[PDB]
Amino acid sequence: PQITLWQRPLVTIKIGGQLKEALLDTGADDTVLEEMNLPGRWKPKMIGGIGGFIKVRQYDQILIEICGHKAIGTVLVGPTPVNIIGRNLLTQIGCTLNF
C-alpha cells in the first residue's frame, strides 16, 4: 500500500498469534513493543529516545506479521508510549519513503 501521513501510520501487526496496533516509524532504528510475553532468551539493550535512554529486553528471530507482510527479526520489549515498528522490520516488508 501507499500510506499518507495526515494521521499517524498505525497498522495491525500479529505476534504470538495476537493482533496489536503499531506505528510505522522511519525515525526508529529498532522495533519496540509494549510489555508482552515472548519465547526464548533475551539480551539487554539500551535505546535512546527523545526523552533519554531506557533499558529494554531484546528477543531475536521472532515471527511478526506487519500489515499482512511476514517478517522474522529482532523485537525489543519495554516501556514505550506506543508499539513501534522500526527500520529493522520496515526493510523486511519492503518499505520506502517517497516524495
Ligand X SMILES: COC(=O)N[C@H](C(=O)Nc1ccccc1CC[C@@H]1CN[C@H](COC(=O)NCc2ccccc2)CO1)C(c1ccccc1)c1ccccc1
Q: Catalytic site residues?
A: 25
Going from the C-alpha of 35 to that of each of 1, 19, 49, 57, 91, the distances in angstroms are 29, 14, 17, 10, 24
**Residue 77 DSSP SS3:** strand
30 binds, among a second copy, ligand X, Cl ion, none (CB under 5 to 8 A by kind): ligand X
Question: Is residue 78 a contact residue for Cl ion (CB under 5 A)?
Answer: no
Question: Is residue 47 a contact residue for ligand X (CB under 6 A)?
Answer: yes
Question: Is residue 17 a contact residue for a second copy (CB under 8 A)?
Answer: no
Site for a second copy in 21-40 (CB under 8 A): 23-29, 32
Work out whether strand 69-77 and strand 32-33 pair parallel, antiparallel, or are unpaired. Answer: parallel
